[PDB]
Amino acid sequence: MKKYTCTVCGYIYNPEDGDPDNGVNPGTDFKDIPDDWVCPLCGVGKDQFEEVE
Amino acid sequence: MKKYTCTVCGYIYNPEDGDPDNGVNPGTDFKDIPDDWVCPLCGVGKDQFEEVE
Amino acid sequence: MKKYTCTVCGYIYNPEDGDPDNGVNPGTDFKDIPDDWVCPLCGVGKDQFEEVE
Ligand SMILES: [Fe+3]
Ligand SMILES: [Fe+3]
Ligand SMILES: [Fe+3]
């Protein structure tokens, strides 16, 4: 599964790690993250993220 | 996947659209919506919804 | 699917029942519960739960 980066602040979503404190378990692909989740560091939505190719 | 209607207000849950602002992604069948979700328009629970046949 | 017990208070998570009022639908295995869920009775996190063998 691919990493995604927050293009506003640089946070990297790593699917192996998830974002458990916000209910995103390890192993969650970015597309499957609920669409109301926000960047943990900066608070922006998923639409400011981009895949890391 | 089937549409569901809120029998209190008439809102239609369309699985192709989801309810992303409340964390329900496009492609979520109604049964899989977390059971604490409420109608976005009127605030009632899932138990007031019915399948659109 | 296995039951899990809250080792702090004794609450039993039964996957057939879920915890619907907190968005955990019936049929959710414990591992798949979002990692920010807490014991409904006592408020502690998943890390204080143990499988019932
Ligand atoms: Fe960010
Ligand atoms: Fe409604
Ligand atoms: Fe407990």
Curated annotation (Swiss-Prot), chains A, B, C:
Modification N-formylmethionine, positions: 1
Q: Which cofactor does it need?
A: Fe(3+)
Question: Which residues take part in binding Fe cation?
Answer: 6, 9, 39, 42
Q: Mind listing the UniProt keywords for this protein, alphabetically?
A: Electron transport, Formylation, Iron, Metal-binding, Transport
Domain of life (superkingdom): Bacteria
Q: How is the cofactor bound?
A: Binds 1 Fe(3+) ion per subunit.
UniProt cross-references to InterPro entries, sorted A to Z: Rubredoxin, Rubredoxin-like_dom, Rubredoxin_dom, Rubredoxin_ET, Rubredoxin_Fe_BS
Which CDD domains does UniProt cross-reference here?
rubredoxin
Q: Which GO terms describe its molecular function?
A: electron transfer activity; iron ion binding
GO BP terms: namely: alkane catabolic process
The Rubredoxin-like domain extends over: 1-53
Give the UniProt family note. Answer: Belongs to the rubredoxin family.
Q: What does this protein do?
A: Rubredoxin is a small nonheme, iron protein lacking acid-labile sulfide. Its single Fe, chelated to 4 Cys, functions as an electron acceptor and may also stabilize the conformation of the molecule.
The name this protein goes by in its record: Rubredoxin
Biological source species: Clostridium pasteurianum
